[PDB]
mmCIF file with all atom_site columns, C-alpha atoms in Angstrom:
data_model
loop_
_atom_site.group_PDB
_atom_site.id
_atom_site.type_symbol
_atom_site.label_atom_id
_atom_site.label_alt_id
_atom_site.label_comp_id
_atom_site.label_asym_id
_atom_site.label_entity_id
_atom_site.label_seq_id
_atom_site.pdbx_PDB_ins_code
_atom_site.Cartn_x
_atom_site.Cartn_y
_atom_site.Cartn_z
_atom_site.occupancy
_atom_site.B_iso_or_equiv
_atom_site.pdbx_formal_charge
_atom_site.auth_seq_id
_atom_site.auth_comp_id
_atom_site.auth_asym_id
_atom_site.auth_atom_id
_atom_site.pdbx_PDB_model_num
ATOM 1   C CA . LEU A 1 1   ? 123.632 71.656  163.505 1.00 0.00 ? 1   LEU A CA 1
ATOM 2   C CA . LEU A 1 2   ? 121.611 74.535  165.366 1.00 0.00 ? 2   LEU A CA 1
ATOM 3   C CA . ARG A 1 3   ? 118.987 77.018  163.758 1.00 0.00 ? 3   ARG A CA 1
ATOM 4   C CA . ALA A 1 4   ? 119.031 79.480  165.251 1.00 0.00 ? 4   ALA A CA 1
ATOM 5   C CA . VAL A 1 5   ? 117.666 83.473  165.291 1.00 0.00 ? 5   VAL A CA 1
ATOM 6   C CA . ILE A 1 6   ? 118.693 86.431  168.042 1.00 0.00 ? 6   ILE A CA 1
ATOM 7   C CA . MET A 1 7   ? 116.129 89.299  168.589 1.00 0.00 ? 7   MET A CA 1
ATOM 8   C CA . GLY A 1 8   ? 115.708 92.286  170.136 1.00 0.00 ? 8   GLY A CA 1
ATOM 9   C CA . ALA A 1 9   ? 115.327 96.329  169.775 1.00 0.00 ? 9   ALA A CA 1
ATOM 10  C CA . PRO A 1 10  ? 118.670 98.553  169.428 1.00 0.00 ? 10  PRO A CA 1
ATOM 11  C CA . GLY A 1 11  ? 119.806 99.175  173.154 1.00 0.00 ? 11  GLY A CA 1
ATOM 12  C CA . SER A 1 12  ? 118.478 95.651  174.287 1.00 0.00 ? 12  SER A CA 1
ATOM 13  C CA . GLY A 1 13  ? 121.907 93.716  174.323 1.00 0.00 ? 13  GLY A CA 1
ATOM 14  C CA . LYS A 1 14  ? 121.532 91.849  171.630 1.00 0.00 ? 14  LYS A CA 1
ATOM 15  C CA . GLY A 1 15  ? 125.399 92.967  170.130 1.00 0.00 ? 15  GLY A CA 1
ATOM 16  C CA . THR A 1 16  ? 126.596 92.082  173.777 1.00 0.00 ? 16  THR A CA 1
ATOM 17  C CA . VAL A 1 17  ? 124.713 88.672  174.025 1.00 0.00 ? 17  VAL A CA 1
ATOM 18  C CA . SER A 1 18  ? 124.978 87.456  170.118 1.00 0.00 ? 18  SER A CA 1
ATOM 19  C CA . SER A 1 19  ? 128.999 87.833  171.079 1.00 0.00 ? 19  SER A CA 1
ATOM 20  C CA . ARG A 1 20  ? 129.223 86.574  173.914 1.00 0.00 ? 20  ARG A CA 1
ATOM 21  C CA . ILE A 1 21  ? 127.241 83.317  172.294 1.00 0.00 ? 21  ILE A CA 1
ATOM 22  C CA . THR A 1 22  ? 129.877 83.542  169.380 1.00 0.00 ? 22  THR A CA 1
ATOM 23  C CA . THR A 1 23  ? 132.228 83.091  171.807 1.00 0.00 ? 23  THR A CA 1
ATOM 24  C CA . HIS A 1 24  ? 131.332 80.625  173.540 1.00 0.00 ? 24  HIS A CA 1
ATOM 25  C CA . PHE A 1 25  ? 129.817 78.179  171.066 1.00 0.00 ? 25  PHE A CA 1
ATOM 26  C CA . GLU A 1 26  ? 130.431 76.376  168.012 1.00 0.00 ? 26  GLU A CA 1
ATOM 27  C CA . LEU A 1 27  ? 129.073 78.281  165.429 1.00 0.00 ? 27  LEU A CA 1
ATOM 28  C CA . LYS A 1 28  ? 128.558 81.485  162.601 1.00 0.00 ? 28  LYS A CA 1
ATOM 29  C CA . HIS A 1 29  ? 127.261 84.588  163.713 1.00 0.00 ? 29  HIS A CA 1
ATOM 30  C CA . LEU A 1 30  ? 125.268 85.585  160.844 1.00 0.00 ? 30  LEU A CA 1
ATOM 31  C CA . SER A 1 31  ? 124.617 89.921  160.898 1.00 0.00 ? 31  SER A CA 1
ATOM 32  C CA . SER A 1 32  ? 122.557 90.883  158.338 1.00 0.00 ? 32  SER A CA 1
ATOM 33  C CA . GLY A 1 33  ? 124.378 94.674  159.162 1.00 0.00 ? 33  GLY A CA 1
ATOM 34  C CA . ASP A 1 34  ? 127.563 93.174  158.941 1.00 0.00 ? 34  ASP A CA 1
ATOM 35  C CA . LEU A 1 35  ? 126.551 92.053  156.444 1.00 0.00 ? 35  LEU A CA 1
ATOM 36  C CA . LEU A 1 36  ? 125.310 94.650  154.422 1.00 0.00 ? 36  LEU A CA 1
ATOM 37  C CA . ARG A 1 37  ? 128.379 96.838  155.868 1.00 0.00 ? 37  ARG A CA 1
ATOM 38  C CA . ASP A 1 38  ? 130.974 94.539  154.146 1.00 0.00 ? 38  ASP A CA 1
ATOM 39  C CA . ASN A 1 39  ? 129.367 94.275  150.818 1.00 0.00 ? 39  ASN A CA 1
ATOM 40  C CA . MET A 1 40  ? 129.491 98.623  151.191 1.00 0.00 ? 40  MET A CA 1
ATOM 41  C CA . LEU A 1 41  ? 132.895 98.713  152.107 1.00 0.00 ? 41  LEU A CA 1
ATOM 42  C CA . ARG A 1 42  ? 133.580 95.896  149.011 1.00 0.00 ? 42  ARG A CA 1
ATOM 43  C CA . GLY A 1 43  ? 131.729 98.850  146.508 1.00 0.00 ? 43  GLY A CA 1
ATOM 44  C CA . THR A 1 44  ? 129.631 95.532  145.002 1.00 0.00 ? 44  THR A CA 1
ATOM 45  C CA . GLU A 1 45  ? 126.482 96.619  143.410 1.00 0.00 ? 45  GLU A CA 1
ATOM 46  C CA . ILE A 1 46  ? 123.950 95.142  147.006 1.00 0.00 ? 46  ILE A CA 1
ATOM 47  C CA . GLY A 1 47  ? 126.516 97.356  148.881 1.00 0.00 ? 47  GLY A CA 1
ATOM 48  C CA . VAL A 1 48  ? 125.811 100.755 146.795 1.00 0.00 ? 48  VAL A CA 1
ATOM 49  C CA . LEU A 1 49  ? 121.971 99.649  146.935 1.00 0.00 ? 49  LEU A CA 1
ATOM 50  C CA . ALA A 1 50  ? 122.472 99.098  150.470 1.00 0.00 ? 50  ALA A CA 1
ATOM 51  C CA . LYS A 1 51  ? 124.117 102.588 151.086 1.00 0.00 ? 51  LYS A CA 1
ATOM 52  C CA . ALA A 1 52  ? 121.233 104.529 149.364 1.00 0.00 ? 52  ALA A CA 1
ATOM 53  C CA . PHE A 1 53  ? 118.491 103.196 151.328 1.00 0.00 ? 53  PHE A CA 1
ATOM 54  C CA . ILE A 1 54  ? 120.172 103.253 154.437 1.00 0.00 ? 54  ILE A CA 1
ATOM 55  C CA . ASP A 1 55  ? 121.750 106.959 153.854 1.00 0.00 ? 55  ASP A CA 1
ATOM 56  C CA . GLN A 1 56  ? 117.763 107.912 153.450 1.00 0.00 ? 56  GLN A CA 1
ATOM 57  C CA . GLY A 1 57  ? 117.188 106.160 156.488 1.00 0.00 ? 57  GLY A CA 1
ATOM 58  C CA . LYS A 1 58  ? 114.850 103.145 154.783 1.00 0.00 ? 58  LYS A CA 1
ATOM 59  C CA . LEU A 1 59  ? 114.895 99.604  155.502 1.00 0.00 ? 59  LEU A CA 1
ATOM 60  C CA . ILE A 1 60  ? 116.712 97.657  153.109 1.00 0.00 ? 60  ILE A CA 1
ATOM 61  C CA . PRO A 1 61  ? 113.620 96.033  150.269 1.00 0.00 ? 61  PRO A CA 1
ATOM 62  C CA . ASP A 1 62  ? 112.236 92.579  151.575 1.00 0.00 ? 62  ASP A CA 1
ATOM 63  C CA . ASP A 1 63  ? 112.996 90.777  148.655 1.00 0.00 ? 63  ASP A CA 1
ATOM 64  C CA . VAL A 1 64  ? 116.435 92.635  148.289 1.00 0.00 ? 64  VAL A CA 1
ATOM 65  C CA . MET A 1 65  ? 117.703 92.014  151.532 1.00 0.00 ? 65  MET A CA 1
ATOM 66  C CA . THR A 1 66  ? 115.885 87.979  151.575 1.00 0.00 ? 66  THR A CA 1
ATOM 67  C CA . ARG A 1 67  ? 117.760 87.247  148.160 1.00 0.00 ? 67  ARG A CA 1
ATOM 68  C CA . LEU A 1 68  ? 121.339 88.662  149.853 1.00 0.00 ? 68  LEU A CA 1
ATOM 69  C CA . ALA A 1 69  ? 120.866 86.743  153.072 1.00 0.00 ? 69  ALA A CA 1
ATOM 70  C CA . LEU A 1 70  ? 120.201 83.397  151.717 1.00 0.00 ? 70  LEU A CA 1
ATOM 71  C CA . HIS A 1 71  ? 122.406 83.617  149.019 1.00 0.00 ? 71  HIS A CA 1
ATOM 72  C CA . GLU A 1 72  ? 124.854 83.850  152.422 1.00 0.00 ? 72  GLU A CA 1
ATOM 73  C CA . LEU A 1 73  ? 123.264 80.908  153.610 1.00 0.00 ? 73  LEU A CA 1
ATOM 74  C CA . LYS A 1 74  ? 123.650 78.284  150.704 1.00 0.00 ? 74  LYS A CA 1
ATOM 75  C CA . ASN A 1 75  ? 126.884 78.171  151.302 1.00 0.00 ? 75  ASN A CA 1
ATOM 76  C CA . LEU A 1 76  ? 127.179 78.310  155.253 1.00 0.00 ? 76  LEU A CA 1
ATOM 77  C CA . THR A 1 77  ? 125.266 74.940  155.637 1.00 0.00 ? 77  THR A CA 1
ATOM 78  C CA . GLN A 1 78  ? 127.589 72.950  157.161 1.00 0.00 ? 78  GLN A CA 1
ATOM 79  C CA . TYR A 1 79  ? 127.765 74.775  160.150 1.00 0.00 ? 79  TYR A CA 1
ATOM 80  C CA . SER A 1 80  ? 125.750 75.650  162.965 1.00 0.00 ? 80  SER A CA 1
ATOM 81  C CA . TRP A 1 81  ? 124.056 79.876  162.148 1.00 0.00 ? 81  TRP A CA 1
ATOM 82  C CA . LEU A 1 82  ? 122.940 82.420  164.873 1.00 0.00 ? 82  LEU A CA 1
ATOM 83  C CA . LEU A 1 83  ? 121.009 84.631  162.769 1.00 0.00 ? 83  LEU A CA 1
ATOM 84  C CA . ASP A 1 84  ? 121.092 88.170  164.245 1.00 0.00 ? 84  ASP A CA 1
ATOM 85  C CA . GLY A 1 85  ? 118.774 90.933  162.266 1.00 0.00 ? 85  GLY A CA 1
ATOM 86  C CA . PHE A 1 86  ? 117.443 88.648  159.743 1.00 0.00 ? 86  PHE A CA 1
ATOM 87  C CA . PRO A 1 87  ? 114.757 88.248  159.302 1.00 0.00 ? 87  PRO A CA 1
ATOM 88  C CA . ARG A 1 88  ? 113.585 91.945  160.542 1.00 0.00 ? 88  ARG A CA 1
ATOM 89  C CA . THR A 1 89  ? 109.693 91.645  159.123 1.00 0.00 ? 89  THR A CA 1
ATOM 90  C CA . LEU A 1 90  ? 107.060 89.028  158.790 1.00 0.00 ? 90  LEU A CA 1
ATOM 91  C CA . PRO A 1 91  ? 108.096 88.604  154.973 1.00 0.00 ? 91  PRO A CA 1
ATOM 92  C CA . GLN A 1 92  ? 111.499 88.063  155.618 1.00 0.00 ? 92  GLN A CA 1
ATOM 93  C CA . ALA A 1 93  ? 110.770 85.904  158.112 1.00 0.00 ? 93  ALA A CA 1
ATOM 94  C CA . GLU A 1 94  ? 108.555 83.958  155.757 1.00 0.00 ? 94  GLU A CA 1
ATOM 95  C CA . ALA A 1 95  ? 110.742 83.647  153.180 1.00 0.00 ? 95  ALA A CA 1
ATOM 96  C CA . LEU A 1 96  ? 112.975 82.055  155.537 1.00 0.00 ? 96  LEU A CA 1
ATOM 97  C CA . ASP A 1 97  ? 110.808 79.577  157.289 1.00 0.00 ? 97  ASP A CA 1
ATOM 98  C CA . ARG A 1 98  ? 110.685 77.972  152.967 1.00 0.00 ? 98  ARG A CA 1
ATOM 99  C CA . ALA A 1 99  ? 114.377 77.722  152.758 1.00 0.00 ? 99  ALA A CA 1
ATOM 100 C CA . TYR A 1 100 ? 115.503 76.370  156.122 1.00 0.00 ? 100 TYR A CA 1
ATOM 101 C CA . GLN A 1 101 ? 113.386 74.615  159.056 1.00 0.00 ? 101 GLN A CA 1
ATOM 102 C CA . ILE A 1 102 ? 114.431 77.213  162.196 1.00 0.00 ? 102 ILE A CA 1
ATOM 103 C CA . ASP A 1 103 ? 114.388 75.409  165.175 1.00 0.00 ? 103 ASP A CA 1
ATOM 104 C CA . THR A 1 104 ? 115.641 77.980  167.927 1.00 0.00 ? 104 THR A CA 1
ATOM 105 C CA . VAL A 1 105 ? 114.249 82.023  168.249 1.00 0.00 ? 105 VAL A CA 1
ATOM 106 C CA . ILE A 1 106 ? 115.758 83.788  171.209 1.00 0.00 ? 106 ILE A CA 1
ATOM 107 C CA . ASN A 1 107 ? 114.081 86.963  172.099 1.00 0.00 ? 107 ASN A CA 1
ATOM 108 C CA . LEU A 1 108 ? 115.752 90.039  174.660 1.00 0.00 ? 108 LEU A CA 1
ATOM 109 C CA . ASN A 1 109 ? 112.382 91.182  176.143 1.00 0.00 ? 109 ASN A CA 1
ATOM 110 C CA . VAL A 1 110 ? 114.073 94.266  177.658 1.00 0.00 ? 110 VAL A CA 1
ATOM 111 C CA . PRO A 1 111 ? 111.319 96.694  179.055 1.00 0.00 ? 111 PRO A CA 1
ATOM 112 C CA . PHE A 1 112 ? 110.789 100.048 176.337 1.00 0.00 ? 112 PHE A CA 1
ATOM 113 C CA . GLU A 1 113 ? 111.152 102.085 179.105 1.00 0.00 ? 113 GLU A CA 1
ATOM 114 C CA . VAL A 1 114 ? 114.446 100.977 180.113 1.00 0.00 ? 114 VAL A CA 1
ATOM 115 C CA . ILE A 1 115 ? 115.624 101.052 176.621 1.00 0.00 ? 115 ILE A CA 1
ATOM 116 C CA . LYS A 1 116 ? 114.580 104.494 175.801 1.00 0.00 ? 116 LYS A CA 1
ATOM 117 C CA . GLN A 1 117 ? 116.768 105.790 179.361 1.00 0.00 ? 117 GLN A CA 1
ATOM 118 C CA . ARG A 1 118 ? 119.798 103.897 177.435 1.00 0.00 ? 118 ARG A CA 1
ATOM 119 C CA . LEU A 1 119 ? 119.682 105.098 173.919 1.00 0.00 ? 119 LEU A CA 1
ATOM 120 C CA . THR A 1 120 ? 119.004 108.721 175.235 1.00 0.00 ? 120 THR A CA 1
ATOM 121 C CA . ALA A 1 121 ? 121.599 108.472 178.034 1.00 0.00 ? 121 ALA A CA 1
ATOM 122 C CA . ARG A 1 122 ? 124.502 110.059 176.318 1.00 0.00 ? 122 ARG A CA 1
ATOM 123 C CA . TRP A 1 123 ? 125.330 113.658 176.326 1.00 0.00 ? 123 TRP A CA 1
ATOM 124 C CA . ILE A 1 124 ? 128.141 115.638 175.136 1.00 0.00 ? 124 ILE A CA 1
ATOM 125 C CA . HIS A 1 125 ? 130.640 118.895 175.558 1.00 0.00 ? 125 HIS A CA 1
ATOM 126 C CA . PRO A 1 126 ? 130.891 120.008 172.223 1.00 0.00 ? 126 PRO A CA 1
ATOM 127 C CA . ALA A 1 127 ? 133.897 121.886 172.244 1.00 0.00 ? 127 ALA A CA 1
ATOM 128 C CA . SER A 1 128 ? 136.382 118.882 173.932 1.00 0.00 ? 128 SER A CA 1
ATOM 129 C CA . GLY A 1 129 ? 134.023 116.035 173.182 1.00 0.00 ? 129 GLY A CA 1
ATOM 130 C CA . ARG A 1 130 ? 133.736 114.683 176.639 1.00 0.00 ? 130 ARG A CA 1
ATOM 131 C CA . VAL A 1 131 ? 130.600 112.325 177.191 1.00 0.00 ? 131 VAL A CA 1
ATOM 132 C CA . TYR A 1 132 ? 129.080 111.881 179.857 1.00 0.00 ? 132 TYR A CA 1
ATOM 133 C CA . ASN A 1 133 ? 126.605 109.385 180.241 1.00 0.00 ? 133 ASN A CA 1
ATOM 134 C CA . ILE A 1 134 ? 123.683 110.078 182.796 1.00 0.00 ? 134 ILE A CA 1
ATOM 135 C CA . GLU A 1 135 ? 123.260 106.316 183.967 1.00 0.00 ? 135 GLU A CA 1
ATOM 136 C CA . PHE A 1 136 ? 127.651 105.567 183.830 1.00 0.00 ? 136 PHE A CA 1
ATOM 137 C CA . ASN A 1 137 ? 128.988 108.996 184.410 1.00 0.00 ? 137 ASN A CA 1
ATOM 138 C CA . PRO A 1 138 ? 126.736 111.676 184.916 1.00 0.00 ? 138 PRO A CA 1
ATOM 139 C CA . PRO A 1 139 ? 128.363 115.502 184.642 1.00 0.00 ? 139 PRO A CA 1
ATOM 140 C CA . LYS A 1 140 ? 128.878 116.867 188.781 1.00 0.00 ? 140 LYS A CA 1
ATOM 141 C CA . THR A 1 141 ? 126.548 119.709 187.955 1.00 0.00 ? 141 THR A CA 1
ATOM 142 C CA . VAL A 1 142 ? 123.295 118.432 185.564 1.00 0.00 ? 142 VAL A CA 1
ATOM 143 C CA . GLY A 1 143 ? 123.709 120.129 182.216 1.00 0.00 ? 143 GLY A CA 1
ATOM 144 C CA . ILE A 1 144 ? 126.903 121.177 182.332 1.00 0.00 ? 144 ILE A CA 1
ATOM 145 C CA . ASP A 1 145 ? 130.439 120.301 181.541 1.00 0.00 ? 145 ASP A CA 1
ATOM 146 C CA . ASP A 1 146 ? 132.993 119.165 184.970 1.00 0.00 ? 146 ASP A CA 1
ATOM 147 C CA . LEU A 1 147 ? 135.961 121.309 183.406 1.00 0.00 ? 147 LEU A CA 1
ATOM 148 C CA . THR A 1 148 ? 134.510 124.579 181.652 1.00 0.00 ? 148 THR A CA 1
ATOM 149 C CA . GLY A 1 149 ? 131.078 124.781 183.226 1.00 0.00 ? 149 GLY A CA 1
ATOM 150 C CA . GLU A 1 150 ? 129.830 125.446 180.151 1.00 0.00 ? 150 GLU A CA 1
ATOM 151 C CA . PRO A 1 151 ? 126.178 123.277 178.053 1.00 0.00 ? 151 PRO A CA 1
ATOM 152 C CA . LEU A 1 152 ? 125.698 119.871 177.278 1.00 0.00 ? 152 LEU A CA 1
ATOM 153 C CA . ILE A 1 153 ? 123.751 118.971 174.333 1.00 0.00 ? 153 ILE A CA 1
ATOM 154 C CA . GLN A 1 154 ? 123.006 115.200 173.095 1.00 0.00 ? 154 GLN A CA 1
ATOM 155 C CA . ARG A 1 155 ? 123.689 114.838 169.627 1.00 0.00 ? 155 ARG A CA 1
ATOM 156 C CA . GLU A 1 156 ? 120.233 114.223 167.351 1.00 0.00 ? 156 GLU A CA 1
ATOM 157 C CA . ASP A 1 157 ? 120.294 110.274 167.327 1.00 0.00 ? 157 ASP A CA 1
ATOM 158 C CA . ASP A 1 158 ? 120.487 110.375 171.125 1.00 0.00 ? 158 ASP A CA 1
ATOM 159 C CA . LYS A 1 159 ? 117.840 112.757 171.557 1.00 0.00 ? 159 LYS A CA 1
ATOM 160 C CA . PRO A 1 160 ? 114.608 111.145 173.012 1.00 0.00 ? 160 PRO A CA 1
ATOM 161 C CA . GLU A 1 161 ? 111.591 112.237 170.204 1.00 0.00 ? 161 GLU A CA 1
ATOM 162 C CA . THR A 1 162 ? 114.224 110.586 167.613 1.00 0.00 ? 162 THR A CA 1
ATOM 163 C CA . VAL A 1 163 ? 115.097 107.839 169.861 1.00 0.00 ? 163 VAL A CA 1
ATOM 164 C CA . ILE A 1 164 ? 111.392 107.204 170.303 1.00 0.00 ? 164 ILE A CA 1
ATOM 165 C CA . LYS A 1 165 ? 110.584 106.671 166.560 1.00 0.00 ? 165 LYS A CA 1
ATOM 166 C CA . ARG A 1 166 ? 113.258 104.324 166.534 1.00 0.00 ? 166 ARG A CA 1
ATOM 167 C CA . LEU A 1 167 ? 111.736 101.968 169.114 1.00 0.00 ? 167 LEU A CA 1
ATOM 168 C CA . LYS A 1 168 ? 108.260 102.360 167.539 1.00 0.00 ? 168 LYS A CA 1
ATOM 169 C CA . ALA A 1 169 ? 109.366 101.322 164.026 1.00 0.00 ? 169 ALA A CA 1
ATOM 170 C CA . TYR A 1 170 ? 111.702 98.896  165.884 1.00 0.00 ? 170 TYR A CA 1
ATOM 171 C CA . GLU A 1 171 ? 108.047 97.318  167.395 1.00 0.00 ? 171 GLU A CA 1
ATOM 172 C CA . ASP A 1 172 ? 106.252 97.834  164.074 1.00 0.00 ? 172 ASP A CA 1
ATOM 173 C CA . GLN A 1 173 ? 108.739 95.563  162.439 1.00 0.00 ? 173 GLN A CA 1
ATOM 174 C CA . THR A 1 174 ? 109.413 92.930  164.620 1.00 0.00 ? 174 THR A CA 1
ATOM 175 C CA . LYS A 1 175 ? 105.847 92.288  166.441 1.00 0.00 ? 175 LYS A CA 1
ATOM 176 C CA . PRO A 1 176 ? 104.618 90.714  164.033 1.00 0.00 ? 176 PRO A CA 1
ATOM 177 C CA . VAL A 1 177 ? 107.520 88.710  163.226 1.00 0.00 ? 177 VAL A CA 1
ATOM 178 C CA . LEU A 1 178 ? 107.619 87.058  167.501 1.00 0.00 ? 178 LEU A CA 1
ATOM 179 C CA . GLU A 1 179 ? 104.307 86.216  166.792 1.00 0.00 ? 179 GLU A CA 1
ATOM 180 C CA . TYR A 1 180 ? 104.745 83.936  164.089 1.00 0.00 ? 180 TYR A CA 1
ATOM 181 C CA . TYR A 1 181 ? 107.304 82.555  166.189 1.00 0.00 ? 181 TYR A CA 1
ATOM 182 C CA . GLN A 1 182 ? 105.846 82.466  169.496 1.00 0.00 ? 182 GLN A CA 1
ATOM 183 C CA . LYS A 1 183 ? 102.749 80.579  167.532 1.00 0.00 ? 183 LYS A CA 1
ATOM 184 C CA . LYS A 1 184 ? 105.234 77.983  165.738 1.00 0.00 ? 184 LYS A CA 1
ATOM 185 C CA . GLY A 1 185 ? 105.973 77.067  169.292 1.00 0.00 ? 185 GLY A CA 1
ATOM 186 C CA . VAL A 1 186 ? 110.068 78.492  168.691 1.00 0.00 ? 186 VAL A CA 1
ATOM 187 C CA . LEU A 1 187 ? 110.279 81.626  170.354 1.00 0.00 ? 187 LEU A CA 1
ATOM 188 C CA . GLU A 1 188 ? 112.470 81.044  173.763 1.00 0.00 ? 188 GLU A CA 1
ATOM 189 C CA . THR A 1 189 ? 111.922 85.167  175.556 1.00 0.00 ? 189 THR A CA 1
ATOM 190 C CA . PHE A 1 190 ? 114.906 86.276  177.968 1.00 0.00 ? 190 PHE A CA 1
ATOM 191 C CA . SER A 1 191 ? 113.365 89.368  179.908 1.00 0.00 ? 191 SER A CA 1
ATOM 192 C CA . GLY A 1 192 ? 115.317 91.369  182.483 1.00 0.00 ? 192 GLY A CA 1
ATOM 193 C CA . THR A 1 193 ? 116.932 94.713  182.535 1.00 0.00 ? 193 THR A CA 1
ATOM 194 C CA . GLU A 1 194 ? 120.351 94.421  183.014 1.00 0.00 ? 194 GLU A CA 1
ATOM 195 C CA . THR A 1 195 ? 121.850 92.145  180.086 1.00 0.00 ? 195 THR A CA 1
ATOM 196 C CA . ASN A 1 196 ? 124.569 90.772  182.681 1.00 0.00 ? 196 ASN A CA 1
ATOM 197 C CA . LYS A 1 197 ? 121.209 89.535  184.287 1.00 0.00 ? 197 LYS A CA 1
ATOM 198 C CA . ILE A 1 198 ? 119.527 88.040  181.086 1.00 0.00 ? 198 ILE A CA 1
ATOM 199 C CA . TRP A 1 199 ? 122.692 85.903  179.346 1.00 0.00 ? 199 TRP A CA 1
ATOM 200 C CA . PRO A 1 200 ? 123.250 83.360  182.310 1.00 0.00 ? 200 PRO A CA 1
ATOM 201 C CA . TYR A 1 201 ? 120.001 82.123  181.044 1.00 0.00 ? 201 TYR A CA 1
ATOM 202 C CA . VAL A 1 202 ? 120.557 82.800  177.728 1.00 0.00 ? 202 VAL A CA 1
ATOM 203 C CA . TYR A 1 203 ? 123.858 80.448  178.145 1.00 0.00 ? 203 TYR A CA 1
ATOM 204 C CA . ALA A 1 204 ? 122.810 77.810  179.961 1.00 0.00 ? 204 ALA A CA 1
ATOM 205 C CA . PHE A 1 205 ? 119.455 77.547  177.425 1.00 0.00 ? 205 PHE A CA 1
ATOM 206 C CA . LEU A 1 206 ? 122.024 77.284  174.532 1.00 0.00 ? 206 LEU A CA 1
ATOM 207 C CA . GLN A 1 207 ? 123.905 73.767  177.059 1.00 0.00 ? 207 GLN A CA 1
ATOM 208 C CA . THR A 1 208 ? 121.984 71.506  174.662 1.00 0.00 ? 208 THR A CA 1
ATOM 209 C CA . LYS A 1 209 ? 121.308 73.005  171.695 1.00 0.00 ? 209 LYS A CA 1
ATOM 210 C CA . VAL A 1 210 ? 124.639 73.610  170.493 1.00 0.00 ? 210 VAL A CA 1
ATOM 211 C CA . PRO A 1 211 ? 128.154 72.076  171.311 1.00 0.00 ? 211 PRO A CA 1
ATOM 212 C CA . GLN A 1 212 ? 130.659 74.265  173.220 1.00 0.00 ? 212 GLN A CA 1
#
């Protein structure tokens, strides 16, 4: 049975790649964010704790997150796994190593400038809610709405300052995790600037590793 982790920065295409892996291979997709959000929805104590941290822009503490992830995994050992979002930090990776033999770690290596561009592409016309993406459907005139000529704005989560801070936090957290897995010889890296250029190689890689 496959014991796999997938890693990638926000905007790297991890959601898409993970969804495609789950569609094509006989395994369970175990997303930490989905596990947290399901607990939040069900109003469990770990859910209320999760919200308390998430709402303040904080990571779930390592000890709490690891206890929750391992508890989920305990009752999933009959299946192949793709862990997605855990481990997020070196202490989480080390704790996971003490619990299960992890055979494969996939990292999506998309250049910083490409991810930053993807994450800052969205502009909105506030009154109508019309969305423009300067990569995919830019406005006919820079900075203004096609129908009104009124200015476009960027939501706080899409501004370059916010995005740069998010990416730097991600890099600080995961650089040590990637080093850990690389030293262990289980890190497989897929580099590219478009998800559809990367996906075929991930798909081919997994052929010998887990049933279709």
